[PDB]
Design a protein around this ligand. Sequence first.
Ligand SMILES: O=P(O)(O)O[C@H]1[C@H](OP(=O)(O)O)[C@@H](OP(=O)(O)O)[C@H](OP(=O)(O)O)[C@@H](OP(=O)(O)O)[C@H]1OP(=O)(O)O
Ligand SMILES: O=P(O)(O)O[C@H]1[C@H](OP(=O)(O)O)[C@H](OP(=O)(O)O)[C@@H](OP(=O)(O)O)[C@@H](OP(=O)(O)O)[C@H]1OP(=O)(O)O
Ligand SMILES: Nc1ncnc2c1ncn2[C@@H]1O[C@H](COP(=O)(O)OP(=O)(O)O)[C@@H](O)[C@H]1O
Ligand SMILES: Nc1ncnc2c1ncn2[C@@H]1O[C@H](COP(=O)(O)OP(=O)(O)O)[C@@H](O)[C@H]1O
Lengths: 885, 885
Amino acid sequence: MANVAVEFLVENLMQLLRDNVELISGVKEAAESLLQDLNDFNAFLKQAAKCHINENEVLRELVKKIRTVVNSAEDAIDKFVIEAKLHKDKGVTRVLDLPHYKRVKEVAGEIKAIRNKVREIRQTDAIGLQALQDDDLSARGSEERKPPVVEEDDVVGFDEEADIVINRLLGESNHLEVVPVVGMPGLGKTTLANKIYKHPKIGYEFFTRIWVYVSQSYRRRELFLNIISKFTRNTKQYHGMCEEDLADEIQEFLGKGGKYLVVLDDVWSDEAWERIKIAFPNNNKPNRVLLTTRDSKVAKQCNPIPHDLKFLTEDESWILLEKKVFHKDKCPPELVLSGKSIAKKCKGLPLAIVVIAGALIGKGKTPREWKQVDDSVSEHLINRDHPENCNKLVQMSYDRLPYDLKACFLYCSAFPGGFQIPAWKLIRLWIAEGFIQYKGHLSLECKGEDNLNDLINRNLVMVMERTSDGQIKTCRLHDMLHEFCRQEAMKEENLFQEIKLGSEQYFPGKRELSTYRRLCIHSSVLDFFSTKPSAEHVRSFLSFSSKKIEMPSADIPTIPKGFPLLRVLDVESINFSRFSREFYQLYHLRYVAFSSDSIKILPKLMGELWNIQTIIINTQQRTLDIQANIWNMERLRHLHTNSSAKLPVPVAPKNSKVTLVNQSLQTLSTIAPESCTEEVFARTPNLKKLGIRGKISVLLDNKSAASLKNVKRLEYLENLKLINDSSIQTSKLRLPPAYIFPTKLRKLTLLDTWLEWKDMSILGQLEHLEVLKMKENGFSGESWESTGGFCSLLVLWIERTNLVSWKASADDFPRLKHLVLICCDNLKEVPIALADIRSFQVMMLQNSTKTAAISARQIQAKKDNQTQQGTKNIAFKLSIFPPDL
Amino acid sequence: MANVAVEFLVENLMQLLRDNVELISGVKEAAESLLQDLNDFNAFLKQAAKCHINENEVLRELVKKIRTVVNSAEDAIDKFVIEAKLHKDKGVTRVLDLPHYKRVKEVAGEIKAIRNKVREIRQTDAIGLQALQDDDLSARGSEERKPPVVEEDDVVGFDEEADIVINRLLGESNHLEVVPVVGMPGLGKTTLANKIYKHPKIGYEFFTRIWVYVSQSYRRRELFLNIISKFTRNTKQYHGMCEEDLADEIQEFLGKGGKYLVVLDDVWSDEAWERIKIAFPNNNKPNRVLLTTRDSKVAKQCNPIPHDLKFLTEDESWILLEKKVFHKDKCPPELVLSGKSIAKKCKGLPLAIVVIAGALIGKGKTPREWKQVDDSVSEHLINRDHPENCNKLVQMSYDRLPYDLKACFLYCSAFPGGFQIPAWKLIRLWIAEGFIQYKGHLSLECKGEDNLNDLINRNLVMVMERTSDGQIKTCRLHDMLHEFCRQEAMKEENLFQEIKLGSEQYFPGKRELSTYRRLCIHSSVLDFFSTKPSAEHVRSFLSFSSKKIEMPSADIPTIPKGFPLLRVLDVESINFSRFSREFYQLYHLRYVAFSSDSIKILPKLMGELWNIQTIIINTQQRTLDIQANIWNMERLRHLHTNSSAKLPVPVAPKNSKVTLVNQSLQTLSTIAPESCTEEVFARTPNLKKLGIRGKISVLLDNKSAASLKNVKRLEYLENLKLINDSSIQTSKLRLPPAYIFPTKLRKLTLLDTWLEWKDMSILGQLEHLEVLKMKENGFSGESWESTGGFCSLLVLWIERTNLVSWKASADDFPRLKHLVLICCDNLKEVPIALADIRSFQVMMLQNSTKTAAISARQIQAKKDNQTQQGTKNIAFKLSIFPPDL
Ligand SMILES: O=P(O)(O)O[C@H]1[C@H](OP(=O)(O)O)[C@@H](OP(=O)(O)O)[C@H](OP(=O)(O)O)[C@@H](OP(=O)(O)O)[C@H]1OP(=O)(O)O
Ligand SMILES: O=P(O)(O)O[C@H]1[C@H](OP(=O)(O)O)[C@H](OP(=O)(O)O)[C@@H](OP(=O)(O)O)[C@@H](OP(=O)(O)O)[C@H]1OP(=O)(O)O
Ligand SMILES: Nc1ncnc2c1ncn2[C@@H]1O[C@H](COP(=O)(O)OP(=O)(O)O)[C@@H](O)[C@H]1O
Ligand SMILES: Nc1ncnc2c1ncn2[C@@H]1O[C@H](COP(=O)(O)OP(=O)(O)O)[C@@H](O)[C@H]1O
């Protein structure tokens, strides 16, 4: 949406005027005129949005070029910014900088010419929104949206198919056979396969089960390395060996554990099936492979009897439609006729039903809205076979999105098709792109989380993973939606442009690269960098892939020189040996995601960049000394990393009344314990997620800075993580008193701490703690005797525990909702008083005593006894990794 | 041919028995058996070759499988060799190393099985040996072949096309037009193009001429950088510059220099011409482009008036065939009819005639052979349009070719098609693969050179550049011959397999890679080495790329582990930052060519590989401190490098009477002057080409080490090179007396020497020195006055000198034949006395004073009159750089 570009430019310009007079001292007047012009123009574009846009070209034509002048203004302004910073770099003390001052005055001439263009647009019409103001549509206030829990998990109308498939199971023993699930895109084949994968009979029958995603772009070795990843924790040996050895190892592993089931998802071509088939052992067992394909021919090749997936019936369609649109609540009678007509117009395609349900929830719940929806659906679903029917339906749903949401939804298409998107990264990207601007009380990250939740509610986005707490973790757009938004962003809005090379094609030339605004590459990135391409007007660079790629020491400086006006640099997949000096002249940089293996120091020159918000660094080093003055990059909102970052010692300038208090800071992922000192904590009042990695005993020790005591200061802290790297137990560690911890702390993690279970009472005292995950022998002992305290705790996560005996009362864990038991060989059995608690529903048993599993059956049995009685306690489901237990 | 494999196995086994008994001590008996049976198999194969194996099916089978046992015996014996050396590495001092001695003895059980399998078959060979020997053919001795000096430079019946083309040019001035050239493959279009590109009228009209090859698989940036390299020295900067901006610079450079002609060679597809035409400015000047293509459609697109090439007429065919077959000599009358009939049967295709001439040369000069050839060609040329007729003709020529030479043509195909093969590299490959076996007294390299000259004489291999002295420098296979050689070597004899991948295709799997003998990769290789491949029966790896590809720091150890039985490792085009341990365990290594940029120290462990002949290192460093005890690698025959290497100080073992005197050694290309010491020269008695790089002063200084004196010891030296890197003229340098230089010295080169033109008398005193090349101010001064001495000098080459006055008499340069005056911008004129030298044939004057060029034309006119005066004077040719002179 044009408003997004105009607003971003406006915000940048006001920030530039406020923060730095010198940068804009030269052209302050034209800049301010541009700022006022942009404000009024944004008002104009809003008025235009009020009237039908997709219908009238003339309103669109008036809109057209407002952006181009804005884009030119944005460009010219950025060019000026970099030029003036380069002037500073020269450090010329001359009053009249005879060299390059004329050039910067000519840049000021470009700025003035852009001012004249915007003035010309205002001249063509004093506003141009007279006709627009004449007609106003869709007048209404803004209401709230609700965070979604897992809803309508049950699949409407596909249970019979689940039973049919589960009947194909054990059709013939001692054999490997493939079951082809054939259906049109979005018909629910993947959902049906997922259902079959979670079915209790399937889980009980086959000891080992695997989920495998065979995209259209699968990569055999990557596919095999994943399958090997599940079975064995350490994969160092298998990395170095050939794909055929990988297949042989997979075959051995599958043969080890009795019988097995594997689901190959979205097998596009028969050849891929053939190539992948070699991994699975034909070990004379009743093993089965579930295959989800959209092509009939490939399904027939896999097996002459393909299980055709059937359409939903009208009753099923209406049930699904009302469930989706109204969630738990049922449909009001007055809307039932309209909803039934809409569902009957879906012909039984679940995706159509879900998309129209999203459209309905977006529009409202009035009879007129439903009548309009029914009319539009009838209009846009005359035909049946054409896949463009779903595109038209998606268009219908999309047009009703809020403008800011539309920009995020499109910016989702940019991530590779079929690639699961980290939610946190996606949020931080939007904040960098300026899509999301501070509104109301919610902080930007919170607003972005709300945006993603709304999109999930609309059914636009799918959730692939959910954290323990239930929050979304990884999102992937559906393929049809991904294609629709890809086309939209690439053509209609030119939000981003993607270079994907066919074999015969070649990289677009410099002239074409000049037009693109944002760049996303998923083909070979290295071949692109070999071309030495140059674009002055690419501000966003994105490359997402599974395989990590090195940067040849000759191609390193390609990026900063190729693009000098970068904001978003997402090169996480690209491994960098070092950084050229040209990187330290990307002043318009907001986001930096890069991976390195040798980088040990973050250099000082990184400090000079000022607009950066996020920083993500993957390095194999066990230490990452940060020498850049983070205390000066005021906009800094995150410093992510996985090493033991050692923050620089804060030092207030001897002759400054500026306090280096970065009020914007939110995260410090894995800073080193030595840095957990009073000053750094004092400098980050609003910190909201801390984590440490290194010698935790330094925190706990008195001699060092009493770091765990200093942690009391972060009044707002809500996520703590202690990681102990020392593989040597030099002594025992005793936590501090419960009052030292930040009051709001809601999520805590302990890894390799080896704490004494007598301290668990300390964590019990915490009032708000809601997610306690201790892993890698976080707490070491043999007898745990819970002493209550965890009033608010909702989930408990134990892994690699050497605990022999645990004793609990129903009062000890009142709110607990889910329990995870991993590598708990020592523990004999799980206290029954935990079975008493109603909240506790789901628990996972892995690598634990079979007696513990029988007592877990007893726990589920008490919950099932409540079920049989009808007494109301939250329903209970059991997961045990080894079925034998 | 099978004899080649058997002979190589026999030689390697004999060498293993002689040198190292411990490696063979385990299976000495099976080794000696194998040796005997292999000798008998070699004799049997020779006898079968005497007969026509193809004629009889029984024979085909009898020859078949003798090779398989030999290949099987090689694999087992090599595996034992490496395993036993690994045992030595273990250093298990136990009398019975029962653990893992039974593994190496498992390999030994394979060995013994093989020995028994050979004794079988030897028995099967015993039967029928008499039946084979009952028949024989082609009973004749071997005669001498002679060196291939340039001949038949003129092109038969093609001056009509040349004049037509030169007429087509200059049609429309102030405009840029491209003239198509069309015709079937091998029709001579490139020959005509090169003829035109050298015609004096062309060399007079257009100042700027450029010749460019456009393969089937060209790469635009590569050729643009090369085109720029013509006008300016360096290309490394533009390596950081985009293809389109490269094109802009090319256009500027080319437009600055008056008019221009450019020849694009072998254009295949329209898209390529479209993409490439950009660099040429249509700057409103009379400029032309000459493109050669085999397709009519591309030619028509480039211009509606393509120039069809004409077939050679029967008289033209006969004259060409006679010139090729009989060289300068005329045809004997008795063979005239057969020759005319054969030429008539070639239908005027120059390539067919050329290959037929090669075949006739191979057969001999008897009427029976000519009648047989006439019959055969009549047989194989009933059709005209079928391209396979030329394939049949080359097969006919090939059949008569000695198997040593036959092993080439097929190994020649390994180099990427269209690649310019460095002759020296090709010969050292030959030697390393073992295709050239000791037969007589000529040094191996000499035998290779004669093989290559014979290949050229039969016309199978076309030469591209000759060194100054005329010895070949760079050759290639013709396209038709290349496809014929590639198909044949891959299918019939399985000499090697190319891995190059097509679209929607995959790298062959480990099963396929188990049946390969040699790997040639000419396309993406980093992709191949990211597959983590594996093969045990691959002995050779060839990668003749275009760009220098780095090796990712994580993907380095793929080659040593992918192939542990390597001999030839030609990875010159792959930049390695370091070497893995698994590389040092490679023991079957003869040839090792590789590049680098940061490698400063050759590792010590690299000196353990006992079996290496060649070594090539294109390290960018200025210094390459060698620490491998080259003195210990008894088969070392070359140590090529480009930086200034520092050979380890020799130390005769304290307790061994074994002298570390290498007598195979031939070259120490670029050792450091510090390492031109007495001992380093005692240890290389048969050294035959030495070069130095560094501060030449330390040599010419007698206080440090009388090093240019020590050069006196190398009684056989025949190529010296003194390269000075010190850019600071600290002092003047004085050559030692002429009696110090080795007597046979036939080539000398001096760069940055800054010697006083007075010393030139010393170089005059040398009696055999035949080619003197002084580049980048070899001698410093302004007045040179010849005093004689250069009795045998044949080529004089001066580049980048400040010589002003040159004075000489005709008696100072009696034998001179070639004179090159490059970048002599201060010289005034050249002594006209040179006009009197009979041998003086060719002189080239580049970028020099116009007065010198006037004197050059005076010399040219004088020699014209001399030849006109009835004297049997050889033809003279004058090359002057700028057309105005
Ligand atoms: O053909 P090359 O193998 O490349 O070597 C010859 C020359 O030695 P010779 O004249 O005795 O053959 C130099 O020796 P090397 O460097 O190969 O050891 C070489 O020097 P540079 O490659 O460093 O330049 C030179 O190179 P170039 O062809 O570029 O002049 C080249 O000269 P010629 O081929 O004319 O003899
Ligand atoms: O398994 P991981 O991918 O490594 O993620 C877990 C954790 O997952 P859960 O929230 O589901 O327990 C969080 O991952 P995200 O959802 O943020 O992607 C995050 O920890 P927080 O919840 O505290 O943010 C992360 O971070 P870290 O590696 O710093 O602990 C932590 O990793 P671990 O599994 O290694 O603990
Ligand atoms: N019976 C069903 N109930 C709910 N959603 C369904 C059903 N069948 C298909 N779907 C669709 O599947 C989505 C989630 O599964 P998904 O992986 O997208 O499968 P598919 O795209 O094959 O339908 C739902 O949001 C909905 O759009
Ligand atoms: N009169 C001639 N005209 C053309 N080619 C000739 C002639 N005499 C000999 N030849 C040889 O025949 C071949 C002509 O085809 P060639 O130039 O190899 O193929 P292409 O033109 O496709 O590159 C060359 O080897 C050339 O030297």
